[model samples]
Target: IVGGYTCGANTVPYQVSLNSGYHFCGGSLINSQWVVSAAHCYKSGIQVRLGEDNINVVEGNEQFISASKSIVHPSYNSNTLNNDIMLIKLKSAASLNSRVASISLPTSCASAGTQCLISGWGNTKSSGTSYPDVLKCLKAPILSDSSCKSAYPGQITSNMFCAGYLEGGKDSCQGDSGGPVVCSGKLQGIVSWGSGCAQKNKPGVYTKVCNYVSWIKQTIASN
Candidate 1:
């Protein structure tokens, strides 16, 4: 998590660490065998670690699973960063426990100004080079499209939304990509992109999970 504090053990049971030799990004377990993340986070030899708070140590509750397959969105744009969602299928289903579980997907769209929570091991500062060993969490409010566009003109899309502070000081940063943005206890967004970490009026951009519910369901069913 960027501009956030350390999270308690097992607080975010659905949180996943997408490790490509090292922790590259974060993800959310939507089901026993599927993890949702940003398409840009796709890379070779990625492994998924579930029920983990500290990446440096192997906890008894942690489960590391190999990635069987990765499905990047068909219409994902690298330059524009649109349709930036993706899914990773685990080789085997994870064992659900008190410290390992799945999060519920959104049933409806999240409204602007709704307070949300995001968690990851991303950098706390924009210029930082290292990620946190333990998971961190931050509270952010959804921003209106118009307000978001003011910071990034003609970049915000229907498939994307913004969240953070207009005054800055709280946001997702490097190594935080593909993490969860939960609203009302529902998985509502995926950390997609941003100009800089925690800059004034430049809130973090995310892939709206509600807009891709159908696609997610279809992909999971066929995969």
Candidate 2:
């Protein structure tokens, strides 16, 4: 649960920044001028940080930048938690290359049961750390729709995908919501929620990146 190793890990360094006066989760560069993240995280006064390995705040190399505007999903529903995604239009385009980069959204995500990676600055164990600076990440295989639905009935919507260790001790906890879940180096999903932090019997739920392809493109175009 320390450094860049743990059940939780950090998102792309290009999206969230630490030195620019803010922090958020799951940001991806859409093109040259915009990046996407969870709308719920773009509250007033909160800033998006980028380019960091450690999210513990006390350690890790990272940078920060301010967002000129945050555009959320139009049909987002806070009660049912239906659309928890958003995009931030940066005042300027980010400097992109390799180390400081953006992840491409897959044309199609890995089939169910494929092993995937999730990373963010979140609690290690359930009811744990406030915000560890060390970015944490872990691997978990995606479960079948039936299996996930059986585990958390009715919560598995088309917009959501499931991933996490069924045996326990690996997952994205609080503060990880909106982070990317990667597989084969492709951005497949974004951390949304779970029964509890790394709890057995309850797998982590994420927003299916593929399902929002149209929305992503529209958001980017508008920005």
Candidate 3:
């Protein structure tokens, strides 16, 4: 998370980092056994860590588990990062408590300009790596599709949307991919990709979670 502040341990319980190591992606715990993330972060043998506040050290509330199944959206376009969403089924269910719990998915689509919270353990820079041990967070407004499409110009898709500063300061960075962009306590977006971490006229694009609600739930239930 570039141009952001460190997040507290229990404040964002559903915010989790992956890799079973320093961290390669961020994800949200949507349920005891399932997590929501970007398909671009998909890799075999990914270790999911829940209730993780610090990536470098083990917190008391941490739950480490390996994914038993990794389900990427069928229409995912790796070339364009279209439909860039995925779900990971845990090998074993995580124990929920004060410091750990599942977050709610969006009940409805969020409107443009709705302010939201996005958190991650990614680098704080647009270039090079400076992985933060503590989770970093930023507040970026959800931009309208027209505006985001205007910014990206023929690159944006319905499955994707953007949230960030136009002048560019705060935005999600590398390793933040597959992270949560929470608005009204609902998981509305997943940190997917961007031009740079936080560049002028280049906002961070995300997987529009609302657009994939049926796909997420149906996949979870049937799988």
Candidate 4:
């Protein structure tokens, strides 16, 4: 994440690394057997690593689980990035401990101007060549849908919301997709896409988790 610092280990226990050969995206453990992430991050050979702090090293608290199934939202649109969310079911249930737990889904919609926290191991800058070994986090404010629409001009939809500074320099970037955006101690958004990492007037766009609560519940129950 650009303009962020290395986060303390286990600070966000629900955070997980989505590894496809290597760390490609971030995810959040929603339950012992299910994880939530961005639909666009789907790929073959994906694995979920929980209770991890550093991507390059193995930790005793970490649990690596193979994905048994991946369910992308039926309404997910690649072109518009609408409904950009997905879930991964684990082959086996995770052994939750102090360092590995699930994050609570939002009970209600996050209001505009809410101060939220985003964590990931994405690039430090837009043009950076490498990602950080340890997870990074930063604070960003949710922008009103109208304000976000002014920036993207008809691209922002009800399924998505925007967050970050209008002047740039703070946001989730490449490799941060599918990560968590927590507000008021609940999962509010998922890092889906952005227009150039932390660019001026172009805040990071995220899937509105509140809008998919029913879908998430139904998908998990049926799958």
TM-score of each: 0.98, 0.85, 0.97, 0.98
Error of 4 at 31 (Å): 0.5
Give the Cα error of residue 47 in candidate 2, in Å.
2.5
List model 2 lDDT by residue over 157-220, tens digit each.
8877788767777777776776777777777887777787777788888877787788888767
Q: What is the C-alpha RMSD of each candidate to the true structure, in Å?
A: 0.9, 3.3, 1.1, 0.9
RMSD after Cα superposition, model 1 = 0.9
Worst ten in a row by lDDT for model 1: 123-132
List pairs with backbone clashes in candidate 4.
Answer: none
How far out, in Å, is residue 60 in model 1?
Answer: 1.2
How much is 208 displaced in model 2, in angstroms? 0.7
What's the residue-level lDDT of 56 in candidate 4? 89
lDDT of 3 at 180: 95
Candidate 1 per-residue lDDT over residues 132-186, each given as its tens digit: 8999999999999899888899898899999999788899988889999999999
**Over 4 Å off, model 4:** none
lDDT of 1 at 36: 98
Return whichever of 3 and 4 wins on lDDT: 4
lDDT of 3: 0.89
The parts of candidate 2 lying over 4 Å away from their true place are: 1-26, 55-61
Sorting all predicted structures by lDDT, with the top scorer first, yields 1, 4, 3, 2
